[PDB]
C-alpha cells in the first residue's frame, strides 16, 4: 500500500541529511565529497517570459531561469526534517522557485546557499540589480 515519492539515486544523501544534527552542513559536505546533487525535483514546463522574481505564486522563469516547485527545492521538505527558522514553517513549500539555468543541476543546494534580495525580489547575484 502507499505511493513511492523517491528514486534510489537519492537514498544515500536523503538518509545522510535525515540523520544529521546540521542537515544543511551535511548536504554541503556531501557535495564537497563528490556526492551527486538531489534529483527528482519538480521542474516546470513554462513560457520563460515571466517576471523573473525568485519565489513566486506562479512559475515566473525568464529566459535565464528554470522554474521549480518550491517544496522540491527545499532540503528540509525533501528529508522530512525540522525547518531551521524559529517558527518551523517553510518559505518554499506552497510557492514556485526560479533557479538560474547555470545552477539548475542542483536546485536544493542553490536555495540552501543563496538569499533573496528583500528590495527587488531577485536572488543576490542572480540577478539582483542592487
Amino acid at each position: 500500500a502507499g505511493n513511492a515519492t523517491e528514486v534510489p539515486a537519492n537514498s544515500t544523501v536523503l538518509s545522510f541529511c535525515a540523520f544529521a544534527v546540521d542537515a544543511a552542513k551535511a548536504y554541503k559536505d556531501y557535495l564537497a565529497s563528490g556526492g551527486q546533487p538531489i534529483t527528482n525535483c519538480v521542474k516546470m514546463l513554462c513560457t520563460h517570459t515571466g517576471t523573473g522574481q525568485a519565489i513566486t505564486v506562479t512559475p515566473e522563469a525568464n529566459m535565464d531561469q528554470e522554474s521549480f516547485g518550491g517544496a522540491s527545492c527545499c532540503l528540509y521538505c525533501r528529508c522530512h526534517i525540522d525547518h531551521p527558522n524559529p517558527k518551523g514553517f517553510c518559505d518554499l513549500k506552497g510557492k514556485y522557485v526560479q533557479i538560474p539555468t547555470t545552477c539548475a543541476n542542483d536546485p536544493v543546494g542553490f536555495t540552501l546557499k543563496n538569499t533573496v534580495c528583500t528590495v527587488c525580489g531577485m536572488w543576490k547575484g542572480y540577478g539582483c540589480s542592487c
Binding site: 544534527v21 525535483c41 514556485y96
Partner: protein, 286 residues
C-alpha cells in the same frame, strides 16, 4: 525505478500540487506532461492535508570526509566488543488515516530493558513535517498478542529517547567510549534509530576530553557517557548486522546452536539478548 524510502502512506487518491509535492513522482497526474509539470491556474494548493511519510528504507552508505560510518566491519566490532549492545524493535502497523509503514512500539536492548513508545510518525502538512502520534494497530494478532496492551502503555518519544541515552550511558561509561548496536535484519532497527539518533563529525564532551556519544537538542551540546545527564540524543553510534555473517535460518535457530540459557520469551529485549549472544559465540569461538 523507485524506493520505499519516504513512501506516502496516506489514503488520499490524489497526488500533490506542484508547489507542495516534495518530488516529481508525487506531483498529481493532472499536472504532468512531456516528462515535466505545468501550473494550472484554477486548480489550487491543498491547505489541510496530513500525509504519513515512511521511514523504512534508509541506506547509511555515505562516504563523507570527517563523518564516521555507522555500519562497521566485523573485525572493528570485535575490537569494540565492550561497546556491544544488542538491539531489536517490535513494531506496529499504520492504520485508519494511513496504511503502508511500521512505527516503533517496543524497543529492546541486551541490557534486558524494554521501552514502549506511543505510535509516532512523520506527517507531511502544507507547511512542514509534523512528528506526532498516529493511529496504529499491532500486527495481525497471533504471535503479536502481547503488543495489544502495549498500544496504551507507551511513552512520548521525547521521554523514550531520554531513557535510551540514560540506559546506554549507565551501561557503557565504565566499558567503552562508544556504542555498537548488534542487530539481526537491521532494517526496522535503523528506521527506529531515526527517532533517537543524530550524526555528524566527531566531537568532544563539553565537560571533559572524552569523545562525544550524546547530543542535547535543548542546548545544542555534546556529552560523553559520563556527562549525558538529561540528554535526548544518541550521537554518532556504530552498528553491525549479524544476519549477514553467513547464517541460513532465523535468529532463534542460529542462537540455539551455541546457547541453551536464553529461552525465547517472544519480546524485543529477548531478541536483543539472543543477537548479542550469537555475535559473541560466532566472533570469539574457534
Amino acid at each position: 525505478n523507485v524506493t520505499g524510502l519516504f513512501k506516502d502512506c496516506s489514503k488520499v487518491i490524489t497526488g500533490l500540487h506542484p508547489t507542495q509535492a516534495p518530488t516529481h513522482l508525487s506531483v498529481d497526474t493532472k499536472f504532468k506532461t512531456e516528462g515535466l509539470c505545468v501550473d494550472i491556474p484554477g486548480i489550487p494548493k491543498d491547505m489541510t492535508y496530513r500525509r504519513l511519510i515512511s521511514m523504512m528504507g534508509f541506506k547509511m552508505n555515505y562516504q563523507v570526509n570527517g563523518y564516521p560510518n555507522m555500519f562497521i566491519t566485523r573485525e572493528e566490532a570485535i575490537r569494540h566488543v565492550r561497546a556491544w549492545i544488542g538491539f531489536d524493535v517490535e513494531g506496529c502497523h499504520a492504520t485508519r488515516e494511513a496504511v503502508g509503514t511500521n512505527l516503533p512500539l517496543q524497543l529492546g536492548f541486551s541490557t534486558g530493558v524494554n521501552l514502549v513508545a506511543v505510535p509516532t510518525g512523520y506527517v507531511d502538512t502544507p507547511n512542514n513535517t509534523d512528528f506526532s502520534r498516529v493511529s496504529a494497530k499491532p500486527p495481525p494478532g497471533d504471535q503479536f498478542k502481547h503488543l495489544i496492551p502495549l498500544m496504551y502503555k507507551g511513552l512520548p518519544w521525547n521521554v523514550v529517547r531520554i531513557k535510551i541515552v540514560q540506559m546506554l550511558s549507565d551501561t557503557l561509561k565504565n566499558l567503552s567510549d562508544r556504542v555498537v548496536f548488534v542487530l539481526w535484519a537491521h532494517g526496522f532497527e535503523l528506521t527506529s534509530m531515526k527517532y533517537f539518533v543524530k550524526i555528524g563529525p566527531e566531537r568532544t564532551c563539553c565537560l571533559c576530553d572524552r569523545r562525544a556519544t550524546c547530543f542535547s537538542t535543548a542546548s545544542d551540546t555534546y556529552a560523553c557517557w559520563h556527562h549525558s545527564i538529561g540528554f535526548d540524543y544518541v550521537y554518532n553510534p556504530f552498528m553491525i548486522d549479524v544476519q549477514q555473517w553467513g547464517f541460513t535460518g532465523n535468529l532463534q535457530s542460529n542462537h540455539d546452536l551455541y546457547c541453551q540459557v536464553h529461552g525465547n520469551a517472544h519480546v524485543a529485549s529477548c531478541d536483543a539478548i539472543m543477537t548479542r549472544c550469537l555475535a559473541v559465540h560466532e566472533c570469539f569461538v574457534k
